Design a protein around this ligand. Structure first.
Ligand SMILES: *[C@@H]1O[C@H](CO)[C@@H](O[C@@H]2O[C@H](CO)[C@@H](O[C@@H]3O[C@H](CO[C@H]4O[C@H](CO)[C@@H](O)[C@H](O)[C@@H]4O)[C@@H](O)[C@H](O[C@H]4O[C@H](CO)[C@@H](O)[C@H](O)[C@@H]4O[C@H]4O[C@H](CO)[C@@H](O)[C@H](O)[C@@H]4O)[C@@H]3O)[C@H](O)[C@H]2NC(C)=O)[C@H](O)[C@H]1NC(C)=O
Ligand SMILES: *[C@@H]1O[C@H](CO)[C@@H](O[C@@H]2O[C@H](CO)[C@@H](O[C@@H]3O[C@H](CO)[C@@H](O)[C@H](O[C@H]4O[C@H](CO)[C@@H](O)[C@H](O)[C@@H]4O)[C@@H]3O)[C@H](O)[C@H]2NC(C)=O)[C@H](O)[C@H]1NC(C)=O
Ligand SMILES: *[C@@H]1O[C@H](CO)[C@@H](O[C@@H]2O[C@H](CO)[C@@H](O[C@@H]3O[C@H](CO)[C@@H](O)[C@H](O)[C@@H]3O)[C@H](O)[C@H]2NC(C)=O)[C@H](O)[C@H]1NC(C)=O
Ligand SMILES: *[C@@H]1O[C@H](CO)[C@@H](O[C@@H]2O[C@H](CO)[C@@H](O)[C@H](O)[C@H]2NC(C)=O)[C@H](O)[C@H]1NC(C)=O
Ligand SMILES: *[C@@H]1O[C@H](CO)[C@@H](O[C@@H]2O[C@H](CO)[C@@H](O)[C@H](O)[C@H]2NC(C)=O)[C@H](O)[C@H]1NC(C)=O
Ligand SMILES: *[C@@H]1O[C@H](CO)[C@@H](O[C@@H]2O[C@H](CO)[C@@H](O)[C@H](O)[C@H]2NC(C)=O)[C@H](O)[C@H]1NC(C)=O
Ligand SMILES: *[C@@H]1O[C@H](CO)[C@@H](O[C@@H]2O[C@H](CO)[C@@H](O)[C@H](O)[C@H]2NC(C)=O)[C@H](O)[C@H]1NC(C)=O
Ligand SMILES: *[C@@H]1O[C@H](CO)[C@@H](O[C@@H]2O[C@H](CO)[C@@H](O)[C@H](O)[C@H]2NC(C)=O)[C@H](O)[C@H]1NC(C)=O
Ligand SMILES: *[C@@H]1O[C@H](CO)[C@@H](O[C@@H]2O[C@H](CO)[C@@H](O)[C@H](O)[C@H]2NC(C)=O)[C@H](O)[C@H]1NC(C)=O
Ligand SMILES: *[C@@H]1O[C@H](CO)[C@@H](O)[C@H](O)[C@H]1NC(C)=O
Ligand SMILES: *[C@@H]1O[C@H](CO)[C@@H](O)[C@H](O)[C@H]1NC(C)=O
Ligand SMILES: *[C@@H]1O[C@H](CO)[C@@H](O)[C@H](O)[C@H]1NC(C)=O
Ligand SMILES: *[C@@H]1O[C@H](CO)[C@@H](O)[C@H](O)[C@H]1NC(C)=O
Ligand SMILES: *[C@@H]1O[C@H](CO)[C@@H](O)[C@H](O)[C@H]1NC(C)=O
Lengths: 435, 115, 115, 115, 53
């Protein structure tokens, strides 16, 4: 004798394919076009909700990859196009009255403000941004269109809060030690997330969150080799980096009100860009990693490390932003170690050789070419180490290499804690009412 | 906003009054506030057809058919929480939705018009 | 969705329960879901003023004035179908819309407040 | 549309029937008809929670606490107009909004379910 | 030699010779749910508590 009733109950907890918007806070490329950020002290803790995540399959990563590429292209719109310079550039080595031996002093023609008058000037460039044809073409005039970035915006990661649309909910477990997924018991809900920084690199994350107690290795299929194995780090490592060149930046106007910057001259101490890493700090890191890879591969396994295989240095070496300059730094002195058999496996600083480029291709979108305006003074930027990417290559011996290339894995590295639920508040539970 | 959905059953229906007042309160962000306002509409579209016109925790007069997992509806009412029982009755939703409009809302709507 | 609007009269009002649940369920396509949601709103804006608050096939207490084509309202009720009679009463709609708010909704709304 | 808001009090509530039927009737102009339709929604979101489901000039059963500027509520009812008294009760709105959902809508909603 | 007056920094643009630069008056209307208010009162000092409205 049961008579069904109708409710407005809470259990709505379905999948949420959805849109999303931001809560960020000068006209720097984020543009503050989100909302003013609320103090949102509403991590409402819930009691005993068995819910399993899937960090590898969500649209939050897919939208985040779509947002920033569209947002960073939006900052690229009002800047100077600046493609009259793809001409027959001719250069030589930098002259030093005599010595032995990364710069090219370049003879160069160009238009002026007026349409007919030409301009024979000279400037400097690096190695990897110019190609032999002595005549030297630019590196991208196969197929591109060079574009200057406007010299007022900053490429600094300004953190982005995310908030749910009006009618959905952002969920996060405060629980511990996922294997990527996991039925996390304790959970709290939020309307708005915390601030996440717009950083971008490969082979090493930086300025990120920290771990709980140890390394948390994250993957999908450890028995698959084609995965990108994520490594969460417990304790951050100070990385100092520099471009120790006192450099003079001059300015010209290429046409009708189109300014342009170029490396005029350097004051005279030709150096190489580099980064210091504390040696004894780094060996203390890797002992934690092999401590866990015994548990996932075996007690009698040999953990080897090597460099990247090949490809472009964007794939090979460490991509790295710093303060309006886009470094590329070789990291061969970081994976020259082999840990053996998983049983009884200071005041120093290793230093890496780092290169400088100016013509970039962000997220491999071929055709778009953004120019790097060289800046005056010196370069110093300090960053933590938080995230690592390793790749199991295809006996119990095993070699790992620093993988990377997809920037989605960087955002997935710092958004595994979240999920979003759709809301359909309708419950039909029978009782004995009838009337 | 939300709370106590985890470990209770029926006593969660005591606090079904905060669950609506915070609810619903370029172009890519403008898909929000359209499907967000299409929701709270399309259910209240059919909620007026259920007979319960506004917010009342209310009973209809259509029978609960006991073919739909007849399992101790005084006992499971209080102990065994939601999100478990919901999967049990996840299969029989559409059929009740035909019984929301035929039992009370084909017969009984045209029986008060006799006077 | 729709059906039997052609040849019946009054018995079409039996099936006025499928006619709402399927109803309301770049920029040029985004004019839709605005005027589409402005409709079902602007009538239910005034439908709450009619007195009939939700979905009930319901009667008010305002008189039908017999000046408005008094033609056999027991006889034409069943035989002569809609879309014919609607043109007959197409002229007198606005005037009833002043009588929806004055008869029941100026007097009778302020008569239950006496107690 | 609007009228007589200036010099009357309570007799303005006689004509609260034109105040809704004219109400709600590129991208920069498309912010309108979104927040315009978010309004009439978010109050009627909570107006169904007040107990008064549709349009009735209606009374609840929650007490008026007399701590909230107890000033001659038969006398000021008719003479001293609105927009003056509204500033007097502008401070105590949020607290009544907690009393709209607890007095009638926590107790009395779960008292008709006893039968 | 005489340069143009704006080739410091500009981009010259011709206006199309069919449109008119005449002031064609614009009425304004409120969005659906707001109201436009005006006092017919007299002699403001810029501001003023205007009685008639
Ligand atoms: C990982 O996280 C760390 C911190 O969490 C972050 O390090 C920070 O990096 C940013 C950018 O690389 C640093 O900000 C710059 O700091 C320099 C130095 O400022 C110090 O010294 C001056 C004078 O000695 C003091 O006034 C100041 O308070 C500091 O003590 C500044 O010079 C920079 O400001 C200029 O650049 C900005 C962007 O161009 C402008 O917005 C700003 O107005 C300044 O511009 C002026 O100077 C320019 C010089 O060329 C000129 O071009 C302009 O036209 C204008 O004249 C800037 O503030 C910050 O200090 C770092 N903080 C720490 C603790 O290290 C890492 O960057 C991050 N990792 C990554 C990859 O981002
Ligand atoms: C501008 O400067 C750049 C570098 O700053 C310079 O490019 C270099 O030129 C030298 C000489 O042509 C190349 O050096 C070769 O390097 C290999 C390995 O380092 C050596 O083994 C080579 O020695 C053999 O070849 C010589 C050729 O005559 C023989 O004489 C010799 O006995 C050996 O058999 C040789 O030294 C170097 O590869 C390039 N660098 C790059 C990146 O190509 C360039 O030449 C300068 N410009 C001008 C116009 O000189
Ligand atoms: C990267 O650069 C930062 C600064 O640019 C380095 O931090 C500096 O580290 C040294 C020692 O590691 C600190 O010196 C010590 O300071 C204490 C405090 O007074 C003093 O008592 C000691 O005798 C010693 O001199 C220094 O203060 C610190 N500076 C800052 C600003 O933090 C960091 O070590 C560099 N890391 C690497 C790997 O090179
Ligand atoms: C653009 O032209 C340059 C001409 O040097 C090409 O550069 C070399 O191309 C060969 C064949 O692909 C490669 O083996 C070399 O490694 C390239 N040199 C460098 C420095 O990358 C380049 O491939 C051309 N690009 C396209 C798309 O045709
Ligand atoms: C992880 O990936 C590997 C290969 O990508 C899968 O291994 C296969 O397993 C089946 C049955 O265990 C074997 O018949 C195949 O021969 C294996 N593949 C190869 C290339 O040898 C493995 O199943 C995946 N793990 C999961 C959980 O899906
Ligand atoms: C690149 O070569 C040019 C050759 O003209 C150098 O330019 C000359 O530099 C000397 C002294 O450095 C000046 O007295 C001349 O006036 C410069 N010539 C012109 C046309 O300006 C230039 O210095 C070289 N680049 C570098 C970085 O040394
Ligand atoms: C990064 O530095 C390493 C230093 O070892 C370079 O690797 C060597 O390259 C030569 C020829 O390219 C080989 O004969 C050696 O066997 C390599 N050693 C190792 C450890 O790989 C590497 O080429 C550098 N990469 C870049 C992009 O500069
Ligand atoms: C790198 O991570 C460390 C974590 O230990 C940060 O150090 C602390 O950061 C918090 C908040 O950022 C501060 O309240 C503490 O005062 C910091 N402690 C010390 C000893 O510095 C550090 O700030 C991070 N690096 C950067 C550049 O932010
Ligand atoms: C563009 O170039 C012209 C060159 O004559 C500049 O015109 C003169 O500039 C000086 C210095 O600012 C002023 O004192 C004169 O009054 C200007 N002449 C006129 C007719 O205005 C002009 O200033 C330049 N503009 C910019 C932005 O550099
Ligand atoms: C630059 O132009 C001048 C004449 O305009 C010419 O003589 C010179 O050879 C050009 N430079 C190069 C590198 O072609
Ligand atoms: C990872 O966790 C899932 C459940 O979230 C479990 O099925 C799987 O066996 C776990 N794998 C390992 C290696 O612990
Ligand atoms: C670089 O050299 C110039 C002189 O040419 C000097 O004024 C400047 O201070 C130097 N840069 C630094 C960082 O000292
Ligand atoms: C790191 O230190 C341990 C002992 O603390 C030592 O056995 C090991 O050889 C060191 N790593 C390298 C690469 O030498
Ligand atoms: C202008 O009017 C305001 C009130 O609207 C008044 O406070 C102020 O004193 C007036 N000033 C003058 C100069 O009349």
């Amino acid at each position: 004798n049961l008579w069904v009733t109708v409710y407005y109950g809470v259990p709505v907890w379905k999948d949420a394919e959805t849109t999303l918007f931001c809560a960020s806070d000068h006209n720097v490329w984020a543009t503050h076009a989100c909302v003013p950020t609320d103090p949102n002290p509403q991590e409402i803790h819930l009691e005993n909700v068995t819910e399993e995540f899937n960090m590898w399959k969500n649209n939050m990563v897919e939208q985040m990859h779509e947002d920033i590429i569209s947002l960073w292209d939006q900052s690229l719109k009002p800047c100077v196009k600046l493609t009259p310079l793809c001409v027959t550039l001719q250069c030589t080595n930098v002259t030093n009255n005599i010595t032995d031996d990364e710069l090219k002093n370049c003879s160069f023609n160009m238009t002026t403000e007026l349409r007919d008058k030409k301009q024979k000037v000279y400037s400097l460039f690096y190695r990897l941004d110019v190609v032999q044809i002595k005549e030297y073409r630019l590196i991208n005039c196969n197929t591109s269109a060079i574009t200057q970035a406007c010299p007022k915006v900053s490429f600094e990661p300004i953190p982005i809060h995310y908030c749910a649309p009006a009618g959905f909910a952002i969920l996060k477990c405060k629980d511990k030690k996922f294997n990527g997924t996991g039925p996390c018991p304790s959970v709290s809900t939020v309307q708005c997330t915390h601030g996440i920084k717009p950083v971008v690199s490969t082979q090493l994350l930086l300025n990120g969150s920290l771990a709980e107690e140890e390394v948390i290795i994250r993957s999908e299929n450890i028995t698959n080799n084609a995965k990108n194995i994520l490594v969460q780090l417990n304790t951050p490592v100070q990385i100092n980096c520099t471009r120790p060149n006192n450099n003079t930046v001059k300015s010209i106007r290429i046409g009708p009100g189109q300014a342009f910057y170029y490396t005029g001259d350097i004051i005279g101490d030709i150096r190489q860009a580099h980064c210091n890493v504390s040696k004894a700090t780094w060996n203390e890191t890797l002992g934690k990693v092999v401590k866990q890879l015994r548990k996932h591969f075996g007690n009698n396994t040999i953990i080897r490390f090597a460099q990247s295989s090949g490809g472009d240095l964007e794939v090979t070496t460490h991509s790295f932003n710093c303060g309006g300059e886009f470094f590329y730094c070789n990291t061969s002195g970081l994976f020259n170690s082999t840990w053996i058999s998983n049983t009884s496996v200071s005041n120093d600083s290793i230093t890496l050789p780092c290169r400088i480029k100016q013509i970039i291709n962000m997220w491999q979108r071929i055709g778009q070419a953004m120019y790097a305006p060289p800046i005056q003074g010196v370069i110093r930027c300090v960053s933590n180490i938080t995230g690592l990417i390793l790749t199991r290559d295809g006996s119990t011996t095993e070699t790992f290499r620093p993988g990377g290339g997809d920037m989605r894995d960087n955002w997935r590295s710092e958004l595994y804690k979240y999920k979003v639920v759709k809301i359909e508040p309708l419950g039909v539970a029978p009782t004995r009412c009838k009337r | 906003f939300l709370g106590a959905a985890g470990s209770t059953m029926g006593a969660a229906s005591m606090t079904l009054t905060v669950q609506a007042r915070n609810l619903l309160s370029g172009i890519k962000q403008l898909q929000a506030r359209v499907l967000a306002v299409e929701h709270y509409l399309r259910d209240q579209q059919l909620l007026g057809i259920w007979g319960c016109s506004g917010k009342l925790i209310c009973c209809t007069n259509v029978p609960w058919n006991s073919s739909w997992s007849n399992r101790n509806l005084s006992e499971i009412w209080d102990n065994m929480t939601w999100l478990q029982w919901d999967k049990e009755i996840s299969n029989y939703t559409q059929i009740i939705y035909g019984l929301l409009e035929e039992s009370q809302n084909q017969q009984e709507k045209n029986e008060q018009d006799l006077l």
